[PDB]
Write a protein that binds this ligand. Structure first.
Ligand SMILES: CCCCCCCCCCCCCCCCCC(=O)OC[C@H](COP(=O)(O)OC[C@H](N)C(=O)O)OC(=O)CCCCCCCCCCCCCCCCC
Ligand SMILES: *[C@@H]1O[C@H](CO)[C@@H](O[C@@H]2O[C@H](CO)[C@@H](O[C@@H]3O[C@H](CO)[C@@H](O)[C@H](O)[C@@H]3O)[C@H](O)[C@H]2NC(C)=O)[C@H](O)[C@H]1NC(C)=O
Ligand SMILES: *[C@@H]1O[C@H](CO)[C@@H](O[C@@H]2O[C@H](CO)[C@@H](O)[C@H](O)[C@H]2NC(C)=O)[C@H](O)[C@H]1NC(C)=O
Ligand SMILES: CC(C)CCC[C@@H](C)[C@H]1CC[C@H]2[C@@H]3CC=C4C[C@@H](O)CC[C@]4(C)[C@H]3CC[C@]12C
Ligand SMILES: CC(C)CCC[C@@H](C)[C@H]1CC[C@H]2[C@@H]3CC=C4C[C@@H](O)CC[C@]4(C)[C@H]3CC[C@]12C
Ligand SMILES: CC(C)CCC[C@@H](C)[C@H]1CC[C@H]2[C@@H]3CC=C4C[C@@H](O)CC[C@]4(C)[C@H]3CC[C@]12C
Ligand SMILES: *[C@@H]1O[C@H](CO)[C@@H](O)[C@H](O)[C@H]1NC(C)=O
Lengths: 48, 53, 48, 179, 106, 106, 5
């Protein structure tokens, strides 16, 4: 009793998730923050 | 100031052109190597050697 | 006088190299046009 | 003020909820990687909310308008920003794993949830799970748990973004005209 | 008074610009090192060619060391020319358990 | 200088550049991690001008359409198996006609 | 001249 078959399809998905995704989300956060700041920033006249 | 502004603008221009050149080279590396989510297409470098697919 | 059929031995055909010229032209023209537009913008608001 | 207090209360509630969900994730089966259980992000949000409650108590108690108050208001703001970033990252990880898990057929084995993704050719990725009571029980409720958890971190990230936005709008939106 | 970048903020801006420039230069150096080491050129990797239909095509003298065929992998000759196995002044020894077939010298 | 709208455009430009640079750095790190990069070559796959080289095993799925297998100068090529070693040939019709087989005992 | 984006 010793069966051995090798259909294993290894793929480097852990590295992609650990590396690309955090920087993509950081870039998205920075972009939305910049756009919001530019739309805002002195849209209101504080009279008196 | 009339002299530091030129330096700042030139540095911004150089920074951005360097970034664009680097981005183009990296995109070329990605395209010519058939990079995908899984990895280097069929090749897969492992701790003992290679593993073609 | 036939032993095996093995309909799996398919050698790679006369597959010529894929034309890198078109994609290289695309990915060289995009940054070239970007740089040209940038130089025009620099001339425009640096000289005015 | 009142609105920052409400935001901090919502932050603490959502942090405790996501930490409870992550603890349940860990307790169900040790078949899942540390990344797939975002309870660390929940703990980060929890300490964020603890700092927030302490902030909104001390601001209503004493020392309201000194320089150091702002000096760690900036700390509060950046900490909430990192909380939002970690929540969005957890959302992305959960979405990727759910997308992987939602388009495959699985079968049961004697002691594990051994199965493979649909494959054009007979070699493909294989996944096995610890101590599976039934492959039709863990898989079938794991998706529901994932969806609920996704909604949880989405709301938590939105709340964090609003908390970051409110104080900045307090500072850099109104400019004084008269004197 | 005056408007714009006046005091410490100008120094902070110039420091941030310098730091960003340093980071960009470091990234460019890393990419250039990659290009130099792997010999990436306009014609491709210069040693392999990742075809679209999942077929690597080596184009240089390859030293694979030890080969471990696993499944559906049968060493075959190229398209309709030959399959020549040569031993550079060394015997070519087939094997199966105890059965042998050794092409030595003489 | 940089009084008004120029400042609020320069800040946005710097932010966009920083985001692009961060994404590029992430891509570079991903490349450095997918390929086990060393100053000599990818992992143990040493790369030089003449060609490739290995140090260790090399698993292979699917057929291998080599042109001419050779052997090292200092060692004798030693093909091996456990069941049998089959060498075949084909006619103009792509059919097996002659074949040698190093079997279990004969 | 309070500076921000
Ligand atoms: C986003 C783009 C913003 C618009 C933009 O850049 O133009 C803004 C400026 C000039 O226009 P203005 O608002 O009428 O300036 C009045 C100013 N208060 C003055 O009189 O002085 O004009 C500029 O500033 C144009 C040059 C932009 C340089 C920044 C690079 C592009 C950023 C993207
Ligand atoms: C050299 O050895 C190999 C492996 O020991 C032999 O291959 C084996 O051939 C037998 C005979 O057909 C196969 O048995 C049957 O094959 C059919 C194919 O469809 C399958 O449907 C049956 O269930 C049964 O397995 C056997 O599978 C096959 N083994 C492998 C690993 O391919 C080969 O015949 C030997 N060559 C000579 C000349 O003796
Ligand atoms: C095959 O031929 C070579 C070359 O003649 C033989 O090598 C000789 O081996 C003997 C004893 O091992 C030495 O004394 C000679 O000096 C070798 N000759 C050379 C030129 O080096 C080899 O022995 C032959 N193989 C067999 C099985 O006879
Ligand atoms: C704003 C900036 C960061 C955008 C950068 C876009 C880059 C990362 C994207 C846009 C287009 C993409 C390419 C589009 C098509 C293919 C072919 C595919 O078989 C392999 C990936 C490859 C080669 C992609 C690699 C990544 C790529 C170059
Ligand atoms: C938000 C801005 C700043 C940046 C956005 C970057 C996005 C669009 C880019 C960056 C890297 C890119 C990936 C790079 C490589 C691949 C592998 C390819 O086989 C499929 C596409 C895929 C998975 C790309 C998808 C798009 C991608 C994620
Ligand atoms: C009336 C009360 C609420 C005003 C309090 C002022 C607060 C909200 C303001 C004053 C100064 C501001 C900070 C000034 C500088 C930085 C660094 C910058 O890279 C991102 C924004 C950040 C982090 C700001 C966040 C908001 C901030 C802390
Ligand atoms: C090899 O494959 C290509 C596919 O692009 C085909 O056009 C060509 O005819 C094939 N060559 C032979 C000899 O079959």
């Amino acid at each position: 009793e010793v069966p051995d078959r090798d259909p294993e399809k290894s793929s480097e998905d852990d590295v992609y998730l650990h590396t690309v995704i955090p920087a993509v989300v950081v870039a998205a956060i920075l972009l939305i923050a910049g756009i919001i700041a530019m739309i805002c920033y002195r849209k209101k006249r504080k009279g008196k | 100031y009339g002299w530091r502004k030129r330096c700042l603008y030139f540095f911004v221009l150089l920074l951005m052109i360097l970034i664009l050149v680097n981005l183009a080279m990296t995109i070329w590396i990605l395209k010519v190597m058939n990079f995908t989510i899984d990895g280097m297409g069929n090749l897969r470098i492992t701790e003992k050697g290679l593993k073609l697919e | 006088g036939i032993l095996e059929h093995d309909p799996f031995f398919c050698p790679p055909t006369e597959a010529t190299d894929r034309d890198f010229l078109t994609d290289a032209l695309v990915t060289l023209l995009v940054p070239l046009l970007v740089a040209l537009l940038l130089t025009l913008l620099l001339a425009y608001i640096m000289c005015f | 003020c009142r609105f920052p207090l409400l935001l901090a209360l919502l932050q603490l509630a959502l942090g405790i909820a996501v930490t409870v969900l992550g603890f349940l994730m860990a307790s169900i089966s040790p078949s899942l990687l540390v990344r797939d259980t975002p309870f660390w992000a929940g703990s980060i949000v929890c300490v964020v909310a603890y700092l927030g409650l302490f902030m909104l108590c001390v601001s209503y108690q004493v020392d309201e308008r000194t320089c150091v108050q702002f000096s760690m208001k900036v700390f509060y703001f950046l900490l909430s920003a990192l909380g939002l970033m970690v929540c969005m990252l957890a959302v992305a990880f959960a979405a990727h794993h759910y997308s992987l898990l939602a388009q495959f057929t699985c079968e049961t084995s004697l002691d594990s949830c051994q199965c493979k993704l649909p494959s054009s050719e007979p070699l493909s990725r294989a996944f096995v799970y610890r101590d599976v009571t039934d492959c039709t029980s863990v898989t079938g409720t794991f998706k529901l748990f994932l969806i609920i958890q996704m909604v949880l971190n989405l709301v938590c990230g939105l709340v964090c973004l609003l908390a970051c936005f409110v104080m900045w709008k307090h500072r850099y939106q109104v400019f004084y005209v008269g004197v | 008074h005056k408007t714009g970048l006046r005091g410490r903020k100008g120094n902070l801006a110039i420091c941030v610009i310098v730091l960003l420039f340093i980071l960009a230069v470091i990234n460019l150096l890393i990419t250039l090192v990659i290009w130099a080491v792997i010999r990436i050129g306009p014609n491709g990797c210069d040693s392999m060619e990742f075809h679209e239909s999942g077929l690597l095509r080596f184009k240089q003298v390859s030293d694979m060391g030890v080969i471990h065929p696993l499944y559906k992998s049968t060493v075959g000759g190229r398209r309709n020319e030959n399959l020549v196995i040569t031993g550079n002044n060394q015997p070519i020894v087939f094997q199966q358990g105890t059965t042998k077939l050794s092409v030595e010298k003489n | 200088g940089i009084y008004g709208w120029r400042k609020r455009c320069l800040y946005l430009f710097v932010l966009l550049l920083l985001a692009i640079l961060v994404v590029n750095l992430a891509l570079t790190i991903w490349i450095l991690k997918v390929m086990w990069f060393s100053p000599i070559g990818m992992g143990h796959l040493h790369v030089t001008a003449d060609g490739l080289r290995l140090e260790g095993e090399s698993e292979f799925l699917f057929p291998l359409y080599a042109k001419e297998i050779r052997s090292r100068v200092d060692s004798s090529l030693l093909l091996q198996s456990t069941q049998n070693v089959t060498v075949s040939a084909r006619n103009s019709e792509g059919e097996v006609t002659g074949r040698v087989k190093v079997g279990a005992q004969m | 001249a309070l500076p921000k984006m």
